[PDB]
PDB file of C-alpha atoms and ligand atoms in Angstrom:
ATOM      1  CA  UNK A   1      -3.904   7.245  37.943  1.00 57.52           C
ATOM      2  CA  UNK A   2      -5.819   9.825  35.242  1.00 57.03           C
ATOM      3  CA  UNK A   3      -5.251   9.969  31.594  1.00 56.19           C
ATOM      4  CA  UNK A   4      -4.765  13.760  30.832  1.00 58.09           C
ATOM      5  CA  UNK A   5      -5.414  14.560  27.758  1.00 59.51           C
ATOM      6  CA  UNK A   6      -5.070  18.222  26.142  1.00 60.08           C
ATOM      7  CA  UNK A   7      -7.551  20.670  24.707  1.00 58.72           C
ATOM      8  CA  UNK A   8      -8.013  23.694  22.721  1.00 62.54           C
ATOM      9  CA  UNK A   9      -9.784  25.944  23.851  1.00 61.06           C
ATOM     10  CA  UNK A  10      -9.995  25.340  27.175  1.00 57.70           C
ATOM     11  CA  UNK A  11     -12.971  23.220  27.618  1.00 62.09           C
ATOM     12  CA  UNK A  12     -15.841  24.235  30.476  1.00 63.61           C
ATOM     13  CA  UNK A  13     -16.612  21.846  33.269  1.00 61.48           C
ATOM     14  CA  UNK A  14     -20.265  21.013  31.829  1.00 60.48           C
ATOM     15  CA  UNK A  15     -18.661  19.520  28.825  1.00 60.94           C
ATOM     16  CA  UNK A  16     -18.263  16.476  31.119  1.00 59.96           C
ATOM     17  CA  UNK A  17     -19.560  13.583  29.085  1.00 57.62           C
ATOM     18  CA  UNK A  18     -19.402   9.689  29.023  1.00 60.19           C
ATOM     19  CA  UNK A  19     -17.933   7.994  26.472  1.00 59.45           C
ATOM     20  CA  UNK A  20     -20.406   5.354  24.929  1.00 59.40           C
ATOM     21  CA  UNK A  21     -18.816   4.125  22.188  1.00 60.12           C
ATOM     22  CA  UNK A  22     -16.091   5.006  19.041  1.00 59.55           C
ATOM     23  CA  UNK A  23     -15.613   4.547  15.545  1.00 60.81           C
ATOM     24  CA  UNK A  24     -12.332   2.148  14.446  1.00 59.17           C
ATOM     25  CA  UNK A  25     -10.494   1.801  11.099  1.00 58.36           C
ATOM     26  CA  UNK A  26      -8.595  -0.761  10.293  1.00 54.21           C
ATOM     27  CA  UNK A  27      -6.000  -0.070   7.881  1.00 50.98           C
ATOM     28  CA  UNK A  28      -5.439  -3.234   8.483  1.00 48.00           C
ATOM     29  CA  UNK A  29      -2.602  -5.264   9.127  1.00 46.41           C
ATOM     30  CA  UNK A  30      -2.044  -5.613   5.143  1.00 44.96           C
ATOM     31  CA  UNK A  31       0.847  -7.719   4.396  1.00 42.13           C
ATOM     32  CA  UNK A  32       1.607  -9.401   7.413  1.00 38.52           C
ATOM     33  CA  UNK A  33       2.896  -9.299  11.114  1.00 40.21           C
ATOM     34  CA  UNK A  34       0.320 -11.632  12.501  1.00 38.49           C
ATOM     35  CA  UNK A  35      -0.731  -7.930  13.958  1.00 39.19           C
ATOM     36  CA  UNK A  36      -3.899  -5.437  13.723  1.00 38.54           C
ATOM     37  CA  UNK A  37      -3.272  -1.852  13.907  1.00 43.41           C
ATOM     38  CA  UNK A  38      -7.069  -0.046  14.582  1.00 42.54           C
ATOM     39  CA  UNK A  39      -6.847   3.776  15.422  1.00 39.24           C
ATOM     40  CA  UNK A  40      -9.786   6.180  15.828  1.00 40.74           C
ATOM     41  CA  UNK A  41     -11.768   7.644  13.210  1.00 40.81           C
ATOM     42  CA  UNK A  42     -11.648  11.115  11.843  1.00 41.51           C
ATOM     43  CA  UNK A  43     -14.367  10.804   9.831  1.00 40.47           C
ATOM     44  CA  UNK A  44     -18.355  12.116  10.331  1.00 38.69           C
ATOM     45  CA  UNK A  45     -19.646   9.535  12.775  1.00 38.36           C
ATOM     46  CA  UNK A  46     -22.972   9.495  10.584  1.00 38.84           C
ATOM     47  CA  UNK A  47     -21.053   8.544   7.357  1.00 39.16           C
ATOM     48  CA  UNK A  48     -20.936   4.893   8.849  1.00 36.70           C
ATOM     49  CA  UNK A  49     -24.486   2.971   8.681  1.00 33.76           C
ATOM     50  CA  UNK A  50     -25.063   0.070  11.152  1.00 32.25           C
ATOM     51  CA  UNK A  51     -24.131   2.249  14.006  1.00 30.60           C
ATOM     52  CA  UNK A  52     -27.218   4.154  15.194  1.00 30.08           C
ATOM     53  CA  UNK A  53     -25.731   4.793  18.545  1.00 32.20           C
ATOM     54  CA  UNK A  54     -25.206   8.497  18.931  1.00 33.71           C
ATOM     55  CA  UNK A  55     -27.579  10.717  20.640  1.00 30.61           C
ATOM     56  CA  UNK A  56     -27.015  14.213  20.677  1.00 31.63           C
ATOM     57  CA  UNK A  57     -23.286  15.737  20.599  1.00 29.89           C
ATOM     58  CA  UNK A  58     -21.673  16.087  17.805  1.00 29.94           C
ATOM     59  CA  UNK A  59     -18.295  14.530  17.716  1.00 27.96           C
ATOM     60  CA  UNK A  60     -15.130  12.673  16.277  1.00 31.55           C
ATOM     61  CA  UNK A  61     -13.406   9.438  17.681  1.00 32.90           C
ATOM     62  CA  UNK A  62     -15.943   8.656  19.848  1.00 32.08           C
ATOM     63  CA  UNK A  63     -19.153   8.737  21.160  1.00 30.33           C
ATOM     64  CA  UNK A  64     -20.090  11.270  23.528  1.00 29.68           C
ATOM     65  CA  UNK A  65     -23.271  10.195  25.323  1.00 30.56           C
ATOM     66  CA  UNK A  66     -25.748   7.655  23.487  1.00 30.68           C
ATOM     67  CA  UNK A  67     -26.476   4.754  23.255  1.00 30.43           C
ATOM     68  CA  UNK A  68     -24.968   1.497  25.129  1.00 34.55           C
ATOM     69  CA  UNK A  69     -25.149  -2.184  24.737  1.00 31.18           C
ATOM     70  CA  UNK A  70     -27.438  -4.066  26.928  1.00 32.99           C
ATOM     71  CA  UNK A  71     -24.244  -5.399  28.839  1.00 36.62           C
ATOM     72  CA  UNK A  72     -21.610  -7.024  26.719  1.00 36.68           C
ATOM     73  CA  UNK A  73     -19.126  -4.627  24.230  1.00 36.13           C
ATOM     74  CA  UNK A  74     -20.739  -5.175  20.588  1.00 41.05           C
ATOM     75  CA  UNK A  75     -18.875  -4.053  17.589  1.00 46.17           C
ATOM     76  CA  UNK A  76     -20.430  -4.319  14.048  1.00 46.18           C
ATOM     77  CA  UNK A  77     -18.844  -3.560  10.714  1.00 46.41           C
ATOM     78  CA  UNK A  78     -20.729  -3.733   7.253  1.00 43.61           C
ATOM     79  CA  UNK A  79     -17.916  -5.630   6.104  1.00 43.93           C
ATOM     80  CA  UNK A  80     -14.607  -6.438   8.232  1.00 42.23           C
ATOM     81  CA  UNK A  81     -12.943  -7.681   5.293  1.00 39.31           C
ATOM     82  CA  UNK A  82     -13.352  -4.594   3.632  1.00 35.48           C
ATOM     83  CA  UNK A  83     -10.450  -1.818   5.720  1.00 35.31           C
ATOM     84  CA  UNK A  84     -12.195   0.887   4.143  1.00 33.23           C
ATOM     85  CA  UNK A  85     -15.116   0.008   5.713  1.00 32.37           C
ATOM     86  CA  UNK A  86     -15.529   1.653   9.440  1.00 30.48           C
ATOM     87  CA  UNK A  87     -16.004  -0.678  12.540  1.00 32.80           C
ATOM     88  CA  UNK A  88     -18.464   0.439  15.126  1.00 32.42           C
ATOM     89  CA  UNK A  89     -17.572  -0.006  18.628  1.00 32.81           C
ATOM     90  CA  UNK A  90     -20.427   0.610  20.921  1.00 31.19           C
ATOM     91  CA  UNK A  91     -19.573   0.002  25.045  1.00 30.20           C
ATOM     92  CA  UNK A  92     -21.967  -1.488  27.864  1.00 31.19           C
ATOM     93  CA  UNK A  93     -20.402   0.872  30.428  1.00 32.09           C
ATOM     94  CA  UNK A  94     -19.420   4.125  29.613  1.00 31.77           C
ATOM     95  CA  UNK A  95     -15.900   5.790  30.794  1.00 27.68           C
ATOM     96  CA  UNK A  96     -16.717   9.493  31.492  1.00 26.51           C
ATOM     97  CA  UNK A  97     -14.298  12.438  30.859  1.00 26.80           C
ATOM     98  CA  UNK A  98     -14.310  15.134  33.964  1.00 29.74           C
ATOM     99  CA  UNK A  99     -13.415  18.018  32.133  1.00 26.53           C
ATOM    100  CA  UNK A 100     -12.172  20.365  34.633  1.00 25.58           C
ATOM    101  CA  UNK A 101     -11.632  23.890  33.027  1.00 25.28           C
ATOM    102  CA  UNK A 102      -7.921  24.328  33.135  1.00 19.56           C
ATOM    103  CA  UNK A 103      -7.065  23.104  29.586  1.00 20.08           C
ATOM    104  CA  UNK A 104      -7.429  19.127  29.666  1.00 20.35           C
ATOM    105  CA  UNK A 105      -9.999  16.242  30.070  1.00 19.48           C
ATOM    106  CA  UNK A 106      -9.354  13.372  32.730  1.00 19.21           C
ATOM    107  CA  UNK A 107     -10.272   9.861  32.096  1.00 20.21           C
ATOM    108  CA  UNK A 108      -9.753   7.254  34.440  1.00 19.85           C
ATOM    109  CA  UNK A 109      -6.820   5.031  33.686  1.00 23.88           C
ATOM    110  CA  UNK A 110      -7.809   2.006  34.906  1.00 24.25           C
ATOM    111  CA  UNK A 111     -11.510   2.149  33.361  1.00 26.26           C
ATOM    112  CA  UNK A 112      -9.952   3.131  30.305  1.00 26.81           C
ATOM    113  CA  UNK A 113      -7.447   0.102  30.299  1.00 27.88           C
ATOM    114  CA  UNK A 114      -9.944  -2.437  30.669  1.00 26.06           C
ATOM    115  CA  UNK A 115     -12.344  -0.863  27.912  1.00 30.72           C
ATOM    116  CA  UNK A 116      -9.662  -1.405  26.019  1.00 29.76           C
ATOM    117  CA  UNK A 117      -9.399  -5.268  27.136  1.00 27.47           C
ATOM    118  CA  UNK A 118     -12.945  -5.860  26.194  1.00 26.38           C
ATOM    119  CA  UNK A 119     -12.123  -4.198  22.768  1.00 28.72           C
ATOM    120  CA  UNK A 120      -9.195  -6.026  21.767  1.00 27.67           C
ATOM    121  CA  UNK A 121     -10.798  -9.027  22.576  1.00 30.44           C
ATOM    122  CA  UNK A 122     -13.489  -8.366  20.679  1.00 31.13           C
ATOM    123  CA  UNK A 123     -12.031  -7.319  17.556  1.00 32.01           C
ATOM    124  CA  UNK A 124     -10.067 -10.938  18.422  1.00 29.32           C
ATOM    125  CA  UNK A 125     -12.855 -13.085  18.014  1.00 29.90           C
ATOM    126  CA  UNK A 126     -13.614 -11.654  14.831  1.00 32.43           C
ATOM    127  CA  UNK A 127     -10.092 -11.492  12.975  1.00 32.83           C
ATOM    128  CA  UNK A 128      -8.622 -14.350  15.461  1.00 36.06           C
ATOM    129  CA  UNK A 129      -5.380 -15.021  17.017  1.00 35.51           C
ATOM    130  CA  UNK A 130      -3.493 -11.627  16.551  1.00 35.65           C
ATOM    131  CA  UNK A 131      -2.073  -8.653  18.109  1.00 34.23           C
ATOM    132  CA  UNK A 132      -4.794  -5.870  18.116  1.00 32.97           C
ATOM    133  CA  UNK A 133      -2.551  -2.365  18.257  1.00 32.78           C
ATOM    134  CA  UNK A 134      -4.256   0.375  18.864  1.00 32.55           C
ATOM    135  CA  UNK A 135      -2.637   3.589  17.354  1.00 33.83           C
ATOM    136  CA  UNK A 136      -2.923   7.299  16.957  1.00 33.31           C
ATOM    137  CA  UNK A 137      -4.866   8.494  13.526  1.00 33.62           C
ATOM    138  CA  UNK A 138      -2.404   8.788  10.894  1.00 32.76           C
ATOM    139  CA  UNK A 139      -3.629  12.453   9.762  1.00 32.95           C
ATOM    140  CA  UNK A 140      -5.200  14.307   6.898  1.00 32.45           C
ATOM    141  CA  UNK A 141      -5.352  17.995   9.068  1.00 31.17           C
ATOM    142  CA  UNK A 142      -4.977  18.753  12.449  1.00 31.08           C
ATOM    143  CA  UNK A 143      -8.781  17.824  12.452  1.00 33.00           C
ATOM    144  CA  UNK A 144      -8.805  14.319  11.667  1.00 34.38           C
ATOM    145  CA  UNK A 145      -6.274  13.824  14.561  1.00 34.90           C
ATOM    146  CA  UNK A 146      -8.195  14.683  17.226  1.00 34.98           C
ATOM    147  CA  UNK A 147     -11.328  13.748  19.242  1.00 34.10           C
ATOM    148  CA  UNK A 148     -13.165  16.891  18.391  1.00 33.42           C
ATOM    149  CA  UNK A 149     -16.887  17.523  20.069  1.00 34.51           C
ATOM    150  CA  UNK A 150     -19.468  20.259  20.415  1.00 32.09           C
ATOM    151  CA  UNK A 151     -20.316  21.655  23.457  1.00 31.57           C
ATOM    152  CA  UNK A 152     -21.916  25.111  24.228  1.00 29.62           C
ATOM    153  CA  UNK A 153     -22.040  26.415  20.790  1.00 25.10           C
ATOM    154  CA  UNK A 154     -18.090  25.538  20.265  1.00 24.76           C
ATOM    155  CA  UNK A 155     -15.693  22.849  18.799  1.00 25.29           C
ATOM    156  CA  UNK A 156     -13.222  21.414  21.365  1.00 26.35           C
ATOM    157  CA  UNK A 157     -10.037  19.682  20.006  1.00 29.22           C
ATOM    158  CA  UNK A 158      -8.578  17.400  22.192  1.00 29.68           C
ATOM    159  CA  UNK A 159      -4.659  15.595  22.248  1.00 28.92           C
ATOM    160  CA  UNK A 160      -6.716  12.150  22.080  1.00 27.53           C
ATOM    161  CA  UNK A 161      -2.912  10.494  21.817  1.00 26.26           C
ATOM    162  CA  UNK A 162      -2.679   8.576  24.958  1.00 27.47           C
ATOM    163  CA  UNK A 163      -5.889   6.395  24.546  1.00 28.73           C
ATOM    164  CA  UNK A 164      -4.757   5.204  21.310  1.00 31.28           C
ATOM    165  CA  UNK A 165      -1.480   4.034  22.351  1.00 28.83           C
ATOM    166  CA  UNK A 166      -1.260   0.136  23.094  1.00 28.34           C
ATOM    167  CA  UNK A 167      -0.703  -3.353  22.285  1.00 28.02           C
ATOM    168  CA  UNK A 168      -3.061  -5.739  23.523  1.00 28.92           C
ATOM    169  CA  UNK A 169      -2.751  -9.573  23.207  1.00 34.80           C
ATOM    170  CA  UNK A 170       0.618  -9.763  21.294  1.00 34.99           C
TER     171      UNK A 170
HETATM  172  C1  NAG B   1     -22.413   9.175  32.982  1.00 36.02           C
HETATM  173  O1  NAG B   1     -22.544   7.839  33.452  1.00 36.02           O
HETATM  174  C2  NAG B   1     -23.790   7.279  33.866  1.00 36.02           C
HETATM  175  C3  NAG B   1     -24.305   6.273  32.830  1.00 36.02           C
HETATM  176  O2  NAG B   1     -25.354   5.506  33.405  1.00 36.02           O
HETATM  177  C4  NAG B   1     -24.863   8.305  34.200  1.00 36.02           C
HETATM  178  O3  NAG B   1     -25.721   7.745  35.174  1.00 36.02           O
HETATM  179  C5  NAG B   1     -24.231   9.600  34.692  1.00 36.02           C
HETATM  180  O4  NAG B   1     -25.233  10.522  35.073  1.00 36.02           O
HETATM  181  C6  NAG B   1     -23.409  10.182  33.549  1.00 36.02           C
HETATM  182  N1  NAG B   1     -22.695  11.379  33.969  1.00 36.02           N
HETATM  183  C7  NAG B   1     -22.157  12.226  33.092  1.00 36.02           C
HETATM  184  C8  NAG B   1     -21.435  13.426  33.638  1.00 36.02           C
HETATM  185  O5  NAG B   1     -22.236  12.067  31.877  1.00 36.02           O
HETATM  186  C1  NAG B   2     -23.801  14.518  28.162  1.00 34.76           C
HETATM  187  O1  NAG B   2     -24.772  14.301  29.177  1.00 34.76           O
HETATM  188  C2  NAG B   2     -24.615  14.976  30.404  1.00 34.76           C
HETATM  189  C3  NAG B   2     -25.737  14.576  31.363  1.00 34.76           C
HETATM  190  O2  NAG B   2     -26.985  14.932  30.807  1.00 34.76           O
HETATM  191  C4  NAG B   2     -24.657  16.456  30.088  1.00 34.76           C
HETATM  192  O3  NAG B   2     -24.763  17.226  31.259  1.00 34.76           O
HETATM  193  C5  NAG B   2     -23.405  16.776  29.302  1.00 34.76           C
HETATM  194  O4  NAG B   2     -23.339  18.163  29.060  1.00 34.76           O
HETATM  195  C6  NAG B   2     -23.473  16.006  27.984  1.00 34.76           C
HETATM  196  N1  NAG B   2     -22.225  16.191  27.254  1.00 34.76           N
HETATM  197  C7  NAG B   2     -22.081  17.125  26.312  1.00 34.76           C
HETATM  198  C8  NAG B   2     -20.733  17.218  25.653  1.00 34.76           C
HETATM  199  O5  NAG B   2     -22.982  17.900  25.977  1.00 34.76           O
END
């Protein structure tokens, strides 16, 4: 199974990248269900020091291409405490995204999944025993909401509400 996600325009084979890493916000789990919500970032991925992981695309949500962690999922914050501080999520493998032409990019389901294992459990040694939710960005425009990236000249906006759509660790 493939996680389709929608994209406008329709974006060109070549913008095939892999995902290397993304930017979290906790907003965070403020007054209590023994739960973390985290969803992705729509903010510049530059406006958040202690994460010089990007290389060369220019994008929202996560990182296309760039840098990965010598083999172990590493995420940093400048201060976790702090939800209006950004966490940095930086990968040891990278899930790529097969852009095909039609309208979407496919991600594999199963790599995606257990990306998303490493993650939670991750963001579970640091903040504990709690369910880690990870949910859609709660807005601002209709950029904000998406993973947006540069390819070829052009922005591509892409429905990024499918990998930001699970519990993990109740
Ligand atoms: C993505 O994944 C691996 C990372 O090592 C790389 O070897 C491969 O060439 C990359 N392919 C694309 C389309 O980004
Ligand atoms: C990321 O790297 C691959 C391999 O070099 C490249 O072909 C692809 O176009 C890059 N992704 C983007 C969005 O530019």
């Amino acid at each position: 199974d493939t996680i389709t996600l929608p994209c406008r325009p329709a974006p060109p084979p070549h913008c095939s990248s892999n995902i290397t890493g993304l930017i979290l916000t906790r907003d965070g789990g403020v007054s209590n269900d023994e739960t973390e919500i985290f969803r992705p970032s729509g903010g510049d991925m530059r406006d958040i020091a202690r994460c010089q992981i990007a290389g060369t695309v220019v994008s929202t949500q996560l990182f296309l291409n760039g840098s990965l962690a010598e083999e172990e999922v590493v995420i940093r914050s400048v201060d976790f405490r702090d939800n209006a501080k950004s966490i940095c999520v930086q990968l040891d493998t990278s899930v790529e995204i097969d852009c095909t032409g039609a309208g979407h990019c496919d991600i594999s389901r199963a790599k995606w999944d257990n990306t998303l294992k490493q993650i939670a459990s991750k963001l579970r040694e640091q903040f504990g025993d709690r369910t880690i939710i990870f949910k859609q960005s709660s807005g601002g425009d209709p950029e904000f909401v998406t993973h947006s990236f540069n390819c070829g000249g052009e922005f591509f906006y892409c429905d990024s509400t499918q990998l930001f759509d699970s519990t993990w660790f109740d």
